Enzyme design. Structure first.
Site, PDB file in Angstrom:
ATOM      1  N   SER B 197      -1.300  -4.963   1.230  1.00  0.00           N
ATOM      2  CA  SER B 197      -1.789  -3.605   1.539  1.00  0.00           C
ATOM      3  C   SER B 197      -3.279  -3.532   1.051  1.00  0.00           C
ATOM      4  O   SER B 197      -4.091  -4.351   1.487  1.00  0.00           O
ATOM      5  CB  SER B 197      -0.941  -2.569   0.825  1.00  0.00           C
ATOM      6  OG  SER B 197      -1.119  -1.317   1.459  1.00  0.00           O
ATOM      7  N   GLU B 324       5.388  -1.088   9.590  1.00  0.00           N
ATOM      8  CA  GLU B 324       4.262  -0.661   8.768  1.00  0.00           C
ATOM      9  C   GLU B 324       3.937   0.844   8.852  1.00  0.00           C
ATOM     10  O   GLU B 324       2.987   1.286   8.193  1.00  0.00           O
ATOM     11  CB  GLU B 324       3.018  -1.501   9.102  1.00  0.00           C
ATOM     12  CG  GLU B 324       3.283  -2.993   9.095  1.00  0.00           C
ATOM     13  CD  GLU B 324       2.925  -3.653   7.764  1.00  0.00           C
ATOM     14  OE1 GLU B 324       2.540  -2.896   6.856  1.00  0.00           O
ATOM     15  OE2 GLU B 324       3.026  -4.912   7.618  1.00  0.00           O
ATOM     16  N   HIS B 437       6.912  -1.629   4.268  1.00  0.00           N
ATOM     17  CA  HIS B 437       5.836  -2.239   3.503  1.00  0.00           C
ATOM     18  C   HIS B 437       6.359  -2.855   2.226  1.00  0.00           C
ATOM     19  O   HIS B 437       7.232  -2.285   1.557  1.00  0.00           O
ATOM     20  CB  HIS B 437       4.881  -1.177   3.045  1.00  0.00           C
ATOM     21  CG  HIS B 437       3.662  -1.074   3.880  1.00  0.00           C
ATOM     22  ND1 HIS B 437       3.532  -0.133   4.873  1.00  0.00           N
ATOM     23  CD2 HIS B 437       2.475  -1.721   3.795  1.00  0.00           C
ATOM     24  CE1 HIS B 437       2.301  -0.193   5.355  1.00  0.00           C
ATOM     25  NE2 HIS B 437       1.641  -1.145   4.712  1.00  0.00           N
TER      26      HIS B 437
HETATM   27  C1  LIG Z   1      -1.323  -0.144   0.667  1.00  0.00           C
HETATM   28  O1  LIG Z   1      -2.023  -0.554  -0.551  1.00  0.00           O
HETATM   29  C2  LIG Z   1      -0.028   0.542   0.462  1.00  0.00           C
HETATM   30  C3  LIG Z   1       1.068   0.137   1.343  1.00  0.00           C
HETATM   31  C4  LIG Z   1       2.317   0.787   1.255  1.00  0.00           C
HETATM   32  C5  LIG Z   1       2.473   1.849   0.275  1.00  0.00           C
HETATM   33  C6  LIG Z   1       1.383   2.224  -0.609  1.00  0.00           C
HETATM   34  C7  LIG Z   1       1.650   3.353  -1.581  1.00  0.00           C
HETATM   35  S1  LIG Z   1       1.088   3.132  -3.294  1.00  0.00           S
HETATM   36  C8  LIG Z   1       2.186   1.949  -4.280  1.00  0.00           C
HETATM   37  C9  LIG Z   1       3.218   1.390  -3.286  1.00  0.00           C
HETATM   38  C10 LIG Z   1       3.014   0.143  -2.610  1.00  0.00           C
HETATM   39  C11 LIG Z   1       1.759  -0.725  -2.834  1.00  0.00           C
HETATM   40  N1  LIG Z   1       3.973  -0.296  -1.713  1.00  0.00           N
HETATM   41  C12 LIG Z   1       5.103   0.383  -1.427  1.00  0.00           C
HETATM   42  C13 LIG Z   1       5.997  -0.149  -0.500  1.00  0.00           C
HETATM   43  C14 LIG Z   1       7.201   0.574  -0.174  1.00  0.00           C
HETATM   44  C15 LIG Z   1       7.511   1.797  -0.788  1.00  0.00           C
HETATM   45  C16 LIG Z   1       6.606   2.329  -1.739  1.00  0.00           C
HETATM   46  F1  LIG Z   1       6.950   3.520  -2.332  1.00  0.00           F
HETATM   47  C17 LIG Z   1       5.364   1.628  -2.073  1.00  0.00           C
HETATM   48  C18 LIG Z   1       4.425   2.122  -2.999  1.00  0.00           C
HETATM   49  N2  LIG Z   1       4.620   3.333  -3.655  1.00  0.00           N
HETATM   50  C19 LIG Z   1       0.154   1.566  -0.518  1.00  0.00           C
HETATM   51  C20 LIG Z   1      -2.160   0.749   1.617  1.00  0.00           C
HETATM   52  F2  LIG Z   1      -2.206   2.032   1.020  1.00  0.00           F
HETATM   53  F3  LIG Z   1      -3.464   0.321   1.835  1.00  0.00           F
HETATM   54  F4  LIG Z   1      -1.444   0.993   2.822  1.00  0.00           F
END
Ligand SMILES: *[C@](O)(c1cccc(CSCc2c(C)nc3cccc(F)c3c2N)c1)C(F)(F)F
Ligand SMILES: *[C@@H]1O[C@H](CO)[C@@H](O[C@@H]2O[C@H](CO)[C@@H](O)[C@H](O)[C@H]2NC(C)=O)[C@H](O)[C@H]1NC(C)=O
Ligand SMILES: *[C@@H]1O[C@H](CO)[C@@H](O[C@@H]2O[C@H](CO)[C@@H](O)[C@H](O)[C@H]2NC(C)=O)[C@H](O)[C@H]1NC(C)=O
Ligand SMILES: *[C@](O)(c1cccc(CSCc2c(C)nc3cccc(F)c3c2N)c1)C(F)(F)F
Ligand SMILES: *[C@@H]1O[C@H](CO)[C@@H](O)[C@H](O)[C@H]1NC(C)=O
Ligand SMILES: *[C@@H]1O[C@H](CO)[C@@H](O)[C@H](O)[C@H]1NC(C)=O
Lengths: 532, 532
Positions: B197, B324, B437
């Site tokens: 991400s 996504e 994601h």
């Molecule tokens: C990327 O950095 C991203 C992608 C998906 C979610 C988020 C939210 S912030 C922390 C987080 C992350 C990195 N991944 C997740 C996957 C699934 C479920 C989640 F709750 C979660 C979370 N919080 C950030 C971008 F933002 F660039 F898309």
């Protein structure tokens, strides 16, 4: 005598003709207007002055002056549409096939030929009304009308060449059928007009035109709609092409009077020879002299007439063929030929879209191209060819008709929609062209019932159902036999939008005919072109 | 001692940790920069001044100050991403998992966490590097970097808050790994950076940035690309949001100095509390403080850097997950909820597209809607929901990454592309969200090898192949075992564009990953928005 009919214009004498081992009467070449020759050329037609004696109605009349296709000398596929009689400006006649013995009061069907408003004849073998008059017991009429510059040269404001006179020729013939068809055993309160391509668009134009609504009861439109992008032009564009036509023949151009005068001294073939030089774009599926939105024949724009319900409210039966792009791509787009499979390169694909959507800017050409390209296989020659066929057909016939049926249905009294896709057993045109324009006319006119023509038995069966749907609809406003046992063609409603396939297999009902592409052509592309 | 490493910044003392019935060393919380606190807040980081004695590296460090998700208290699906340590502006540390016995010179992998540039932690359980260090025999590093306003507030021109400082934190940690990883048995000429991400986008940004190219060898990007529409802003837009952030905290706004001064006196939570109030549009998938195109870290626009080949030329391995769009639609679009199937009405479908393409005018919103609507079934709630997921994912992650890989491949030294679509056996998020994601991070970090976690055997097998692909690629520039017998992941070439699915079934090779939609997002929509 059964071949002698006394009409309000005078006495008429027909001829007995054989049909499927029986016989019916045919009154051919009945005149319905004064010959529009000399100082009458380009003018509104005038009613035929009654005559003394007996009009010999035993042979076909002349065909109106028109462009003759010579692309494939000898090929029956193209020659069958060319005039089969001497051509002459003296051409305003109609033909009538009457059941024998003579009916007292039956359903009347009036055929209006297509030909892009630049050609066409009522005397072609594919339009012989004897099989349908005879089988369905209807009085069958085919009319005629001036085409090309002769029928549509438009210098709005002038009364000498006002435009739409070819539409007024059709109207006059309908006025004559309204006034005299009773003498042939025809019911004037039950006349259905029907036509294909420009003929289908004309049928729709009489539905819109206040001046024509009272002369008929019901309508059938085949591969033609009044709002088709090739079917009309603004008064300004018509004036522009009339002037340009004038410039091509060295005419004095400083007054409508001088221009008209000049055009009237020219022989028919001189007008026909330069008629294609006035188109504004390098295009495909566009014709020079067509109806004009003049404020008379059509009181306002077609779209506002459609939105406000300003049109005749009745039942209509209409549809398209699967391959409405083939014919014009063959004749005018690079990469297509009659004797090859015409696989199309990516390069010709784009030249084709350019030719198909003349009025489009680059963002627009890009939208069409994106919309019809499979990006996983962009160099597939068959896909590119078939893609072009869909683009041409959707843009020019299918989507304009789907727009018209959806608009009409909101105020009409019954709509029946078809999608004709029978694969001919007797291919005459190459196979890649598919179910080409006009192939359904063969079934509507019942050619498959004649053995010497070699159609399959299932094609004869298809012809009999189509003829009976058309005739039953003409008689009643419904193609279906009241309480029959056959599958029921459903009514098309603004909500469920049903239509049927028309082919040799068990009737299949579908919905939203080509909605995906037509939302693109009727809603998205127009908004895009207007923004940019 | 094996847990004592002498580095150029000083001596460090680790801790032996158990892994899959064996043990490795872990050096946690090694500092790589001076704490960016007080007058240092918003400033470029400075190198950590060497220390005397032995740094206790046995426990995780603090996590940078950041927004904490509270949408689902208790739900492990969301809580697992929240900081699991005290938060503090003093947070610039890195973690290292080292095989035991200590390698002499092996492949080094440096992990960069995601979190939209507004959050993230290197200490999460899903990022525990012991399973991968241990299984693949690599020295695994996870770094940390300032997020939110702390890492990306941008007042271009000012040296006090120039922007991109969070990117400079990552760079500094990479400089430290370059300078000291040899002492941990790591090969500094073989370091692969990888992230997901925002972490994936950051990896791509270090590939573009001249100042970062020399600190690593190869890169892996997961669901993140540097040209993603949410990954950067112009200097003007950054200035605008910094000022707006200032206005939300009653700051004196007439000089960068007064503004910065003011922002520096505010407690971390005051900045975090109003950070979302500065977005320019009512949007989804947009974050307040992100990298700025400043002319320094990035010499020119990303697109021109991509076109001209102005970037590090090496091998890259990258890909996306099938779904996504799910996560951001759940959190921000009307009609979605965690505990329902979230069938979406036509009305919410359009509110959603509006939220997903903020910078679009009406013709643009119409183009997206046409592009993703099945007009034969426009009210199908599942289709509308799934359509939105594709729109969000295509626009924000998949198509920007496909644009980046196609551009990179023209100058790179080898590309490997994947499309991860394994359907979790242990669903924690609702089923409608699909392959969300970050679910692949679980396999990259090898969580399925631990029994108490309940993954299926085929998931353990998938985890071992993914870990071995990542590690083998890090070691050699190729995910495949030289002369192995397993199916070969093909190289992605500008001509054939191959990629593989990554799931529990036999490897399947495909081509042109989502070309149909990406030609729309990368070519057509942009030309349309620029015309209008
Ligand atoms: C990327 O950095 C991203 C992608 C998906 C979610 C988020 C939210 S912030 C922390 C987080 C992350 C990195 N991944 C997740 C996957 C699934 C479920 C989640 F709750 C979660 C979370 N919080 C950030 C971008 F933002 F660039 F898309
Ligand atoms: C076509 O028009 C006829 C008459 O204008 C419609 O028939 C009427 O239908 C309404 C509602 O069913 C009744 O209240 C009237 O009693 C009917 N009148 C007659 C004479 O039958 C008919 O519904 C219309 N058909 C379509 C398809 O619109
Ligand atoms: C990656 O780069 C290497 C070296 O720069 C490329 O290898 C060269 O390939 C060309 C053509 O095959 C040969 O003329 C050279 O002899 C090779 N050099 C070496 C050291 O092997 C390699 O082709 C590149 N790989 C990709 C995918 O671009
Ligand atoms: C329509 O009137 C039309 C539709 C298809 C072709 C043409 C060309 S002019 C005469 C003609 C007709 C009416 N139909 C044909 C069908 C198949 C093959 C033909 F060669 C053929 C021909 N010539 C006109 C309109 F132009 F409006 F599309
Ligand atoms: C009608 O015309 C045809 C052919 O021109 C002719 O054979 C026929 O005898 C004519 N009938 C009369 C009475 O004129
Ligand atoms: C390192 O810190 C941990 C926990 O704070 C402690 O238990 C351990 O003994 C410390 N080691 C040294 C030598 O400081």
């Amino acid at each position: 005598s059964e071949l002698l009919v006394n009409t309000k214009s005078g006495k008429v004498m027909g001829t007995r003709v054989p049909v499927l081992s029986s016989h019916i009467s045919a009154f051919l070449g009945i005149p319905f207007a004064e010959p529009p020759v000399g100082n009458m050329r380009f003018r509104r037609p005038e009613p035929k002055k009654p005559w003394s004696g007996v009009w010999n109605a035993s042979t076909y009349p002349n065909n109106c002056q028109q462009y003759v296709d010579e692309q494939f000398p000898g090929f029956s596929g193209s020659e069958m549409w060319n005039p089969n009689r001497e051509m002459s400006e003296d051409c305003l006649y109609l033909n009538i096939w009457v059941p024998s013995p003579r009916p007292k009061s039956t359903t009347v069907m009036v055929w209006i030929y297509g030909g892009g408003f630049y050609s066409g004849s009522s005397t072609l073998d594919v339009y012989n009304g004897k099989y349908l008059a005879y089988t369905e017991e209807v009085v069958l009429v085919s009319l005629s009308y001036r085409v090309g510059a002769f029928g549509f040269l438009a210098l709005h404001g002038s009364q000498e060449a006002p435009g739409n006179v070819g539409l007024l020729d059709q109207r006059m013939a309908l006025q004559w059928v309204h006034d005299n068809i009773q003498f042939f055993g025809g019911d004037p309160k039950t006349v259905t007009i029907f036509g294909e391509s420009a003929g289908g668009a004309s049928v729709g134009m009489h539905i819109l035109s206040p001046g024509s609504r009272d002369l008929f009861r019901r309508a059938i439109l085949q591969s033609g709609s009044p709002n088709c992008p090739w079917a009309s032009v603004s008064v300004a564009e018509g004036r522009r092409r009339a002037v340009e036509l004038g410039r091509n023949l060295n005419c004095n151009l400083n007054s409508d009077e001088e221009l008209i005068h000049c055009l009237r001294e020219k022989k028919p073939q001189e007008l026909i020879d330069v008629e294609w030089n006035v188109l504004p774009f390098d295009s495909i599926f566009r014709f020079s002299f067509v109806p004009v939105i003049d404020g008379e024949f059509f009181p306002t724009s077609l779209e506002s007439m459609l939105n406000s319900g300003n049109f005749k409210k009745t039942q209509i039966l209409l549809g398209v063929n699967k391959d409405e792009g083939s014919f014009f791509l063959l004749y005018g787009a690079p990469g297509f030929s009659k004797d090859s499979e015409s696989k199309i390169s990516r390069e010709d694909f784009m030249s084709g879209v350019k030719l198909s959507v003349p009025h489009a800017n680059d963002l627009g050409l890009d939208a069409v191209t994106l919309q019809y390209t499979d990006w996983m296989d962009d160099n597939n020659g068959i896909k590119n060819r078939d893609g072009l066929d869909d683009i041409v057909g959707d843009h020019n016939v299918i989507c304009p008709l789907m727009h018209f049926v959806n608009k009409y249905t909101k105020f009409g009294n019954g709509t029946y929609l078809y999608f004709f896709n029978h694969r001919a057993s007797n291919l005459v045109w190459p196979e890649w062209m598919g179910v080409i324009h006009g192939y359904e006319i063969e079934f509507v006119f019942g050619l498959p019932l004649v053995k010497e023509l070699n159609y399959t038995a299932e094609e004869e069966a298809l012809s009999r159902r189509i003829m009976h749907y058309w005739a039953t609809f003409a008689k009643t406003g419904n193609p279906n036999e009241p309480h029959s046992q056959e599958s029921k063609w459903p009514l098309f409603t603004t909500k469920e939008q049903k239509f049927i396939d028309l082919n040799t297999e068990p009737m299949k009902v579908h919905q939203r005919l080509r909605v995906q592409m037509c939302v693109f052509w009727n809603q998205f592309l127009p908004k895009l072109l207007n923004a940019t």
